[model samples]
Every structure is written in structure tokens, then in C-alpha cells.
Target chain A: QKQIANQFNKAISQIQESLTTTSTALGKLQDVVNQNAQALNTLVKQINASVVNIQEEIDRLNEVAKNLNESLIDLQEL
Target chain B: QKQIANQFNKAISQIQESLTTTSTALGKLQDVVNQNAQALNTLVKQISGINASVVNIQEEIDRLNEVAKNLNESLIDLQEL
Candidate 1:
């Protein structure tokens, strides 16, 4: 039982860490969106340039979510 | 022992459900972003209108994450037992 409990603890810790990363990435993405909104409001024609940056953040978010799902499955199996 | 294990399972299930909701909201947010990207590419003059919609999605994501965190804490307590 002790060993099993330790495994659960490890799994939960991984999940919590991943959730933190997800939250940070979401905040960054939100910032990017808000910045672009400001640019749009200012009649800036270079708004499209930030698309690549947004895409990068989105990719990171997806990866973190994938890892989190795997961790959840591992915990369920335990 | 069985009761404790069941509590862990219940907590895990709640987290899993919240995660699914979070994933869906993220996907919706991504779609909104991509649509706005397309609008920008076409030199549309009305792109800022979606900001409110994006904010709503972000709010939902935050709520789901909070619920997941609480569920995680409950699981931790069960483990400590």
C-alpha cells in the first residue's frame, strides 16, 4: 500500500506541475492576443506578423496537454 | 482501505472531466485565433470584435483549472491517509 501510495503521489505531482505550465502558457497566449488587439486598435498593419508567435504558444499548449493526458491515464491505471 | 481508494478514484474522475472541458475550451480558443488570423491575412478592418469571445473562453479555462486543482488536493489528502 505504501508503494502504491507513493506512485499515486508521483503521478499527482507530475500532473500538478504540468497544470502550472499549462496555466503559464495560457497566460502568455492571452498576453499575445491582448497585444494584438491593441495593435489592431492602433491601426497597425503588422498584426499578422505575430501569428507565428501565437502558433508557437499554441503548439506548446497542445504538447503540455498531451503530456498531462498521459499522466492522467497513468494515474488511472495505478 | 477500499473507501480511501474510492475517494481517490472519485477525485481522479472529477479532474479528468475538468480536463476534458479545458481541452475543448482551448480548441475553441484556437479556432477563434485562427479565424482571426485569416481575417488579418485578408486585411479585414474588424478583427478586434472577437476579443470578448476570447475572454470568455479564457475565463472558462481558468474556472476548469481551478476545479482541477481542488480535485488534485483532495487526492493528495487521500494519499496521505
Candidate 2:
């Protein structure tokens, strides 16, 4: 009985150690994943803003071209 | 041997349940990470289809997580023996 109980105790210790190591690793992985998601979110927002800015510039350029076309037509008529 | 065995059986059950629960939670977290990684990969691929590749860390994590679950299930078989 003594030998058997001793083996059980040893097994318990091994189980505890394994659980602790696994928990620590899971914690670290969670932190790394969360950090990655946060960084990605910020990057996506910046890219969207840049896209919107470029669209605005294109719209302004189109309006300028239309005005220049009308001015050229009037000059030709005069 | 029966008393000693019973005590060990009880301890093993507790350990098995604890590990199973932990494994399940980790599995869910792994899914979330994989989803986020997929989205990131899609974005990066579009930006530079020829020059960029995403590191597939989630698949490795998924494989490790499966081992954890298998270990927990294997212990139950040991108890039967």
C-alpha cells in the first residue's frame, strides 16, 4: 500500500506541473493574439481613412476638369 | 490495493476533468485567433499578392490543442485498465 500510495503522489505532482506549464503557455498565447488583433484593428482604420482621402481628391480633380472644359468651350465660341 | 486504487482513481478523475475543461476553453480561443489571422492574411494578400505571405501560427496551435485533448482522453482509458 505504501508503494502504491507513493506512486500516486508522484503522479499527482507530475499532473500539477503539467497543468501549471499549460496554463502559463495559454496565457502567453492569449496575450500575443490580443495584441495582434489590436494592432490589426488600428492598421485597418488608418487604411480606410487613407482610401477616403484619396477618393475626395479624385472628386475635386473631376470637378476642376469639368470647369476647365466649359471654359474652353466658351473661349472657342467667343 | 483497492483502497489505494480508489484514491488514485479519484485523483485521476479530478485531473482529467480539469484538463478537459481547460482544453475546451483553449480550443475556443484558438478558433478566435484563427479567424482573426485569416482576416489579416486576406488583407495582406490583397495589398501584395506576389510579395506577401502570412505566417500560419494558428494551424500549429490547433495541432497542439488536439494533442492536449487526446492526452486527456487517453487518461480515461488508463483508468479502465
Candidate 3:
């Protein structure tokens, strides 16, 4: 069973307090959502950055392969 | 069952007391949370008022800037002393 708050300054205070606390709790809950979104964004950014870094390394490896082929050709001719 | 009944009665009363204390504590905790929310609502209202005040201030600054600009142009228009 649910009981209503009492009728007096004390009751108002109690209910006021309850309402305040509930609202703040809601605000905190909203913050949690925002924080989670930020976390997801950070995760995505890190993944994107890693992909770019790997792509750069792959390009560098291709350049090294070309250089290696050129060095072998020169050695065979010599 | 007399001895058992006696113990049950005592236990029931104690349980009721414990429930009362727990409920009271829970209610108070809830009140604490709500109190802060109510205060936040009041603070938010004040913030809205402040926002309007800031806009008004900005508008006033813009008007003053226009006046200053006109005054400077007028000075430039004057012949050398």
C-alpha cells in the first residue's frame, strides 16, 4: 500500500527532498548515458586511428618490397 | 506449540519494528535525493533568468558598439585642427 506524504512543513520538506533527490538521480542517469556515448566515440576513434596507422605501415612495406626488388636487380647485373 | 507461539509473537513484533526502522531510513534517503532535485529546479529557474539577462547585456553592448563606430567615423570626417 502507498501512503501519501504528510501535510505540514515537515511533510513538504520530506517530499521536496525526495523530489530533489529523484531529479538529481535522473540527471546523474543522463550523465551516465552521455558518458557511455563518449566512451563509444572514443572507441570508434581509436579503431579508426589504428586502421590508418596499419594502412601507413602497409604502404611503407610495399615501398620496402620495391626497394628490395631494385637492389636484387642491381646485384645480379654486377 | 505454546512455547513456539510465544517465540513467534516476540519475533513478529521485532520484525515489525525492524521493518518500521528500515522504512523510515528508506524514506529519509528518498527525501534526501528529492530535496536536492527540488533545489536544482529552483536553481535552473534562476539560470533561465540569468540567460535572459545575458542576452539583454549583449544587445546593449551591440548598440553601444554601433554608436562608438558612428562617433569614430564622425571624428574622421572632421578637417584637421
Candidate 4:
């Protein structure tokens, strides 16, 4: 619990993070989904979007996670 | 190495993807945290400025659990009938 508690800020920071990323991902995904409608919606808005927007989003997400990793890494490392 | 090369490479892809996602989530949450800091500051300022009819909302958040008393009350009352 201590280990987790320490990372509380960080952990809470990252939970189910991929599934629910920025409205940007959703926004872009909406563009594609509305285009394909049936195929894309059947799989999911995010999964397909993740693949399409994969490289760009991964970089963006990691950059942000580094900051979050900071506080969590703080207590845990200390 | 050869085994990893197959399936177009995605075991830790999910992990990496998850890592990236968690990171992305962190960024957005940071905005919320930062916004809360700013908003709270602004709220305090506004409260001082207005100094009246500002209700203090007390919600005992379950943190991880999405249990809204208001939501529960609405659902339960409907079922209680």
C-alpha cells in the first residue's frame, strides 16, 4: 500500500489512460469514424484511432506521462 | 528476436501503448490539477469578491469508484417504486 500510496498521484494520473485520452484523439477519431461509420464504430472509436493516430499520440502521451512520472517516481524513489 | 519480429511486433506494443496512454492521461489530469489550482484560486477570489450566496459543495468522493449519491438516489428511487 505504501508503495502504491506513494505513487498515488502518479497512479491516479495514469489509470486507464490510453482508453480515455484527449478530446483531440476522440476528435480526430470522430472524423475517421464518421467517414467509415460501420467498420470503425464496430471496432471502437479509440482502438482504431490509436492505430491511425498511433505515432503522434504515443509521443504526446509519453511527453505528458514523464511529468506525472515525476511525482510518483518521487515518493517511490525516495 | 525473430519471434518478436512476427505479429508485426505488438506484445509490449500494448504495454508501450498502455504506457503512452497512461502518460497521455497524466498530461490531461495535470491540466485538471493545474486547472483546479487556478480555478480554486479564482474561486476563492470570486468568493471573496461576491461574498454571498456561494454554496459550498461537499462531496465525499470515492476517488476510484464512480459512485454518485445523486445518481444512485435517482436510480434507486426509480427501482423502489
Indicate which candidate wins on TM-score. Answer: 2
Tens digits of per-residue lDDT for model 1 on B1-81?
A: 645466456547644653764566476557657656655555654355633322236566666676666666555454455
lDDT of 1: 0.54
On the 0 to 100 scale, the lDDT of residue B25 in model 4 is 40
> Taking the candidates in order, what DockQ does each have?
0.05, 0.04, 0.01, 0.04
Q: List the residue pairs that clash in candidate 1.
A: none
Candidate 3 segments exceeding 4 Å error: A1-78, B47-81
Clashing pairs in 4: none
Alpha-carbon shift of residue A40 in model 2 (angstroms): 1.0
RMSD of each: 10.0, 29.3, 38.2, 21.6
Q: State which candidate, 1 or 4, has the greater lDDT.
A: 1
Candidates 1 and 3 compared by DockQ, better number = 1
| TM-score, every prediction | 0.50, 0.55, 0.28, 0.26
Tens digits of per-residue lDDT, candidate 4, A1-78, equal 445444445444554364345424645543443344345334443322111223455455445444333333233222
Stretches of model 1 off by over 4 angstroms after superposition: A44-78, B44-81
In candidate 2, what are the lDDT values of residues B13-77, reduced to their tens digit? 45544544554545556565656656776667553443323344445556655554555444333
- Clashing residue pair totals per candidate (backbone < 3 A): 0, 0, 11, 0
Candidate 3's DockQ is 0.01
Tens-digit lDDT string for candidate 4 (B39-70):
33443452355332222212222221233222
Each candidate: what lDDT?
A: 0.54, 0.48, 0.32, 0.37
Better of 3 and 4 by lDDT: 4
Put down candidate 1 lDDT per residue, A29-74, tens digits, no spaces.
6677657755754565434423323344344444544444433223
